[PDB]
Chain A
Amino acid sequence: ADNEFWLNKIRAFFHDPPDKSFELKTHERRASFILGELKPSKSLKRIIKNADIQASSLQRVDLEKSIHKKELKSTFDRIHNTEKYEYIGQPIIRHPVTGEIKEYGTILANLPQTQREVYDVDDEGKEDYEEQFQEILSRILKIEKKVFDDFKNRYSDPKDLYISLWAFYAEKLKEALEEEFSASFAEEFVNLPAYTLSPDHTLFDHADATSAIFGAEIDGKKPVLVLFKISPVQKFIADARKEKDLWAASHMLSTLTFKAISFIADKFGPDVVIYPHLRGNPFFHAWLHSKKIWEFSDSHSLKIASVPNKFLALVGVSDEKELNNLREGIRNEIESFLADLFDKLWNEVIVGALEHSDALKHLGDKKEIHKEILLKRFTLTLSSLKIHDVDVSGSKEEAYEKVKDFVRSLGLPNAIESKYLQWLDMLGSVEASNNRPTKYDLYSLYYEILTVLNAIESTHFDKPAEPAGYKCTLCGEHLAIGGESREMMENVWGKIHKRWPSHLRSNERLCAVCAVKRFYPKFIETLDIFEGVGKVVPDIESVSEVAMCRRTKHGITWKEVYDYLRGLKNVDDEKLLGKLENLKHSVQTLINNVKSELKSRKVYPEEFLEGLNRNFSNEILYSERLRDFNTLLDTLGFDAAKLGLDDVKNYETMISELRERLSEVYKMLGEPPKYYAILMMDGDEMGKLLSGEKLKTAEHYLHSAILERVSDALRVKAKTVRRLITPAAHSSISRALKNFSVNHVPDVVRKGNGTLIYSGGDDVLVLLPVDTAFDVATELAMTFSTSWNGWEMLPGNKLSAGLLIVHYKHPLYDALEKTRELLQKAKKLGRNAIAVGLLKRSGSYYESVVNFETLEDAKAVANLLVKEQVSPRIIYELLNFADVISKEFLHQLVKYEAVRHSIDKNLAEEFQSVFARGHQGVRVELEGNDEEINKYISDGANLETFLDKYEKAVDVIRKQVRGFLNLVKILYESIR
């Protein structure tokens, strides 16, 4: 039954031994030996192998049948007598996207130093090498057997053992090997490819793809590709007041989509979902801990919403009714989680605040409508594309002709139709009778059509008819809770604010969605995958806190001293310890007076007022906020008029003393920063990359030294035909995306003192101080552009970014919308460019869309500016001349201005050089629909020569220089 299905999935996972590339001759028996008593049957092995060949690496499984006077081989045993094989060379690995070729260093060091490149069957001087190879292979097999035996012994249920193996078998085996051989040995060994003749993906990625395909086709189930989108996202994210609402919205969205993902995974299997790569995901680890499979290791922080709002899975459905049942199950799971949260809120913050009032009875009949309003808020769209079973019976030529004719019957436009016809021809250009097309040959086409369908089918909405009444004050679109009558709503919400003053305010009247999001942080410790992970909610409350994260001139951040004020983290430095202690005593005495006064009014819970020593608003460190008692009370979140304390004036001595102490601290800690940076990034044309257009020709993804030895026809085909991704290649791409988005961005964000909020796949959303915003942006862009960091894959693609520097007092929704507009502008203007914008508290707006390398030189000139090496007046003159300047006297005018406004000749020359180099990369927005110029700027090429050929180069250069000065002005304001 289901246990048999799980055992079959386990067998399909291990049909290829992890050390298959070491010796291809006896790989099947090694796999059967590593599977132990769970070894596959005969026909089940045959169907598993059929699923494997019909799965991805079809650019290898239709290429490993190279019959050029022999069967081409590429292994490590190199005893493959040339009478029938004629091998090529040592195994390599190629990046699935950029085709970057990496050899295997440490694996060869442990291999015997053979005196010849090739060995025959029974030649002399071979016995010792064969004995050494047998010894090392036996050691590897013993290690694998020990690991798998431990895994089998620990877990009794087939499903638990299957999921545990899929999640940690690679990690445990790598740990054992690095304990035995070496760390680099295990790192290289665990990254061996499956099909060595085209090492474009890892062995384990191929194993996961094989398991997914086999599960999709098992028991007569027709494989189907399913894509799910929960929308809208940006509008739901933007509806925030403090940073906590934004974090709660992001985490809630990620939790909902991961609830759907977990339902799918527990139904079919963890590997059935291609994107996101669940392995290594902190949410997946928490889910595993929930299922009592593996205890959470606390290595990866759960406070980050590390799950995208869409997932793509490969599942097998018996019929359409099964797919409809799956969709209804996903929707009901998500709605059940939402209703659980709504009930928790309604019975812990509403009933607990109106335990006896008649207002509870008035809104008691409105529980159903608000529950249904919250449930029907999001749109859950599930789109499924049945994978066609192409008739491959008959001759190889006839089968390929039938497949191509089926492709031609779809009526697709000539561009991608020609692309897929070329792919099919290149597949059919191999010389082998047994070569046959597979159903998953057009997996890329199915994915593209599925994405189009999802983008179309997700535009349908069905939402209820809410009654009249005043709307929520935060979202603004939904009727507020108990908002039927203004007096009733005000009474209810005042009672709730009195009951919960740490979260709400004196004038907040939320709806179901907004209230659930606001109270989301206090509930999640009692939700499914939690209560056993620990510290999910982050210790950051307001957007001003991340602004204070900027480090001062004494190697100490305002946030750190604020945390010292509450006593959380003591300050090690003693040169300012006395002043800090004085300020802490002053603020503690003032808040003690405030809480003692508030306790007299008997309007707030004693428990909440007791903790005001620790959870007082950090905005009191701003000297502006301490102009009187009413503003001080409002800063802490209390309405003086509502409490009637607008006339109290006996605390003026305390406020004045605190202001004096704050000025004393400012004397050498500097004024507390009031500006922070919002940075949201996206993947550049990821749909095009997955569509195959941005992928390179098949020559790179194949073994480097096998193109020549192969037949000429398919040689030229692979020379000029672009590869199309497939389940294992897609899984490897998603694995690289997971590696980046999980192991890299959090680390550089923490090192950059910023607070990462959402890092799901390609996208990233962080809030950082104005100090390290640009540095971390460039670091993350270079990390994403990387292809092979150490021994782990990386996306090897580009990001457009939108960075906004805005005042902490600015409303969160408008700042987020402006940052999204910046990102959209960056994408609109030759992607792989960062769009930097500054929004001052007054309301003035700056703009600049430049390349990612333009920041460094702009940072250099800004550093020269702040260090008083060059007068700031040079900026004003250059802006004045930017309107009337041309490329011919660019350098001369810049040199004159530099030598005039610098300190010496060397500084002027350096300024000229950095200005000349940096200003080349700046995106421009001409009146005409011109993207070619931005494309030329985006790389660094003959664009300068092309500018001479270009007919409006003067406008381009003028916009370039004006934008460079604008961005350097932004940088100078940020540092200063």
Chain B
Amino acid sequence: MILVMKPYDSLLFREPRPFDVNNHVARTILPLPQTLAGAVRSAIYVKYEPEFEILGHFFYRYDGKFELLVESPHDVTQNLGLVKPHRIDKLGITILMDSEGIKFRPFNGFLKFSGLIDYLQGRIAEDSVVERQKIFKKERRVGIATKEEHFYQVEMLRFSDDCGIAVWVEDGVDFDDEGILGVGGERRFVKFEKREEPECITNLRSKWKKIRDKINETGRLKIYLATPAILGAKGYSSKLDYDLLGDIGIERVRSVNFIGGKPVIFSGWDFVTRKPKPTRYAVPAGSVYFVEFEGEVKLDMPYLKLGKLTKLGYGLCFMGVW
């Protein structure tokens, strides 16, 4: 069940840097899955790692047709060209290839679920991508408030009038449909709504077998991070543990190639102990893992949960071919 959350006003999600009296400038980051997970936990508690699992969260735009927007993959150049890693046996090294030069800049933006059903194959259309400005803007409120120095700057997320945030929740765990809850930093709220699972999901769910068998026959698999994941075993590391892919039935891995941005540093407030939660590092959303697996994948779903805190919404990954 999707959870549409249309913001009445702008939203600010606190970055880890403190802001009480000294660091008056308070920037914003993209909504971490923990914040939305806590908001949904409050919502279900009012209606009646949590016992229920949140698959993840994606942006959406409602202009006649209702479509969910997924973070732009790191596998797409700014010229809408895919990047594929091919290995050079002569030099013994593997490089990422865009067929137009060894250097490229990832395309910042989004990718609709129609894009997802076509991007997993290995091609991307033009209409499948949306720029960042079409969804949200960085609205910075200034001079909000012996108070001569209390004037502090705040940057918020100014979503477009037809754009909001949708949270993906597994079937069941039903609760209140229409209502309002607070999300973010400085006290703001959204007008959330409960909507049946979109036809895009079933479009990608039904066509999962084709991509799955293509991956199985070609011996190549790509894993796309829809939401950030904490893949460390003891600490926090970006290296993909080979046992992690052993759950889906990978007998052996030949080579693993991963491209991603700077890690996201975050923490939380432990309401039970009234102390901040341990700091964590997660691989940024939109990163893709290129693996050369031996064997086959027996996963019945086109997605899997990787890492810890997967119930919140972390580690939403899609299996794709390259």
Contact = CB atoms under 8 A, between A and B. Distances in A.
A388 B267 CA distance: 47
Interface of B: 15-18, 22-25, 27, 86, 88, 90-93, 95-103, 140, 142-143, 151, 153, 232, 234-239, 258-263, 265, 267, 270, 273, 275-281
Contacts of B103: 452, 687
Interface in A403-434: 406, 409-413, 415-416
A950 interface: no
- What 10 A-B pairs have minimum CB-CB distances, sorted nearest first? A843-B142, A462-B237, A476-B17, A464-B235, A814-B25, A477-B265, A476-B16, A465-B235, A477-B16, A461-B238
Given A413-B99, A453-B95, A463-B281, A471 B238 contact: no
Contact of A459 (B15, B260, B265, B278): B260
A385 interface: yes
Nearest to A630: B146
A464 B236 contact: yes
Given A410-B90, A413-B101, A477-B16, A461 B96 contact: no
Contact of B102 (A232, A449, A468): A449
Contact of A468 (B97, B260, B265, B278): B278
Contacts of A461: 236-238, 263, 281
B270 A460 contact: no
A452 B18 contact: no
B16 A471 contact: yes
A843 B93 CA distance: 50
B100 A413 contact: yes
Contacts of B99: 413
A151 interface: no
A386 B270 CA distance: 50
Contacts of A712: none
5 contacts: A449-B93, A461-B238, A464-B236, A811-B22, A843-B142
Most buried by A among B18, B23, B102, B281: B102
A452 B232 contact: no
Contacts of B262: 232, 235, 459
A89 interface: no
A696 interface: no
Given A452-B103, A465-B235, A471-B16, 11 more contacts: A388-B90, A411-B86, A411-B97, A412-B102, A453-B95, A459-B261, A465-B232, A468-B276, A468-B277, A477-B267, A811-B25
B101 A460 contact: no
A485 to B, nearest CB: 8
A889 B238 CA distance: 60
Contacts of A467: 278
A448 interface: yes
A235 B261 CA distance: 14
Interface string A460-495: 111111111111010111110000001000000000
B107 to A, nearest CB: 11
Contacts of A415: 100-101
Interface string A158-197: 0000000000000000000000000000000000000000
Given A452-B103, A462-B239, A478 B93 contact: no
Contact of B93 (A385, A477, A811, A813): A385
Contacts of A478: 279
A945 interface: no
* A interface, size bucket: 35 or more
A670 to B, nearest CB: 23
A415 B261 CA distance: 27
A3 interface: no
B239 A842 contact: no
B273 A475 contact: no
- Find the residue from A411, A412, A461, A486 having the highest chain B CB count within 10 A: A461
A385 B94 CA distance: 11
Nearest to A459: B260
Nearest to A509: B18
A470 B22 CA distance: 17
Interface string A819-844: 00000000000000000000000111
Interface string A790-824: 00000000000000000000110110010000000
A448 B270 contact: no
A842 B143 contact: yes
A469 B276 CA distance: 5
B100 A476 contact: no
Contacts of A416: 101-102
Given A411-B86, A416-B101, A460-B258, A449 B236 contact: no
B186 to A, nearest CB: 16
Contact of A471 (B98, B273, B276): B276
Nearest to B19: A476
A468 B18 contact: no
Nearest to A817: B27
Nearest to B104: A452
B69 to A, nearest CB: 20
A471 B18 contact: yes
A467 B92 CA distance: 41
Nearest to B262: A232
A386 B92 CA distance: 8
A816 B123 CA distance: 39
A817 B93 CA distance: 36
B108 to A, nearest CB: 12
Nearest to B86: A411
Contact of A466 (B90, B91, B100, B278): B278
A456 interface: yes
A466 B279 contact: yes
A843 B144 CA distance: 11
Contact of A385 (B91, B234, B273): B91
A47 B278 CA distance: 60
Given A232-B262, A473-B18, A842-B143, A462 B232 contact: yes
Contacts of B17: 475-477, 813
Contacts of A411: 86, 88, 97
A448 B95 CA distance: 11
B278 A476 contact: no
Contacts of B237: 461-463
Contact of B234 (A465, A477, A843): A465
A449 B278 contact: no
Given A415-B100, A449-B91, A462 B236 contact: yes
